[PDB]
Design a protein around this nucleic acid. Sequence first.
DNA 1: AGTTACGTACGGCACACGTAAC
DNA 2: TGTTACGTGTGCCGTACGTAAC
Lengths: 153, 148
Amino acid sequence: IDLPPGFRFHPTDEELITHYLKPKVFNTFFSATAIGEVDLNKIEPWDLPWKAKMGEKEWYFFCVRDRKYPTGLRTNRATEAGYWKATGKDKEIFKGKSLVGMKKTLVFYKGRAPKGVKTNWVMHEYRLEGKYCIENLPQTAKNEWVICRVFQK
Amino acid sequence: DLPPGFRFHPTDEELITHYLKPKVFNTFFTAIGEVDLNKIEPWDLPWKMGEKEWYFFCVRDRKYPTGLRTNRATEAGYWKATGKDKEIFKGKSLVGMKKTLVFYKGRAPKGVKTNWVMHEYRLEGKYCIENLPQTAKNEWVICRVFQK
DNA sequence: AGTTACGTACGGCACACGTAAC
DNA sequence: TGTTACGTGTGCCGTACGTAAC
């Protein structure tokens, strides 16, 4: 609907995990008007705002984390242009006294190599953890499905 | 109703241009909410735009008739400005200034501080010209009050 | 070898609070 | 004497970026 000026989608970390990522992990057909679905392994952050929904300053997008190596137990963070690089320690998301999620901060580098070129594109990847750790998940795509907030400094 | 996460989170400029400016230009104009902020305790302020942060209007009145210094004293305590103000620019044109004040309970020379923090946004960019010479002698501002 | 991730700095931002002004 | 603002200090956040590890 038309939002009065200033009314925007700025959810708290727990609102993202509880009302957005958690339902999608269970139902792959969960749909949200505020947040679309892209594969950051293919799409590039410069072209990202074109393929965005209800977003001007920040863009929210669901994504499927792909394992880099067959036995790597790591995540493919490589794109055609460059590579998303994890920076700093993760941030715990708690619902009441129960840990329900985790936030990782990633900065894009155009190098696609150890000679990465730092960019101003920063992505806040939110992932299901704690009360919803893959160990106690009913064979749903938990580790795979992750919400991502992309913005430019 | 609003889907979860959708809230009133306006930019610095959005506050001055879409809310403060019309109220200054056209007195009393929008569901934004107004409060006297005169002798009102901040914990009793919600008694709401948002339970996270409360946004309310305010009428700054001069403490001293000749002082021109604005009154920030309540029965419960005083609001103490911290650091320096922040510029609000709609392009290359300065439109507003944001002052951060931290509530200090006690109302004494050395009152005990509290976690109440208020971001006061004012129309300082066009204040000097007094485009509209309101004889009401009322300075209208908008404040983001939260206890975080 | 290439790619990712860890983890401790480091710079900016949001105040904390002494010391000056009205 | 009281009350308010000013202005650096600073502690904490948001990354930067080797160095290690997968």
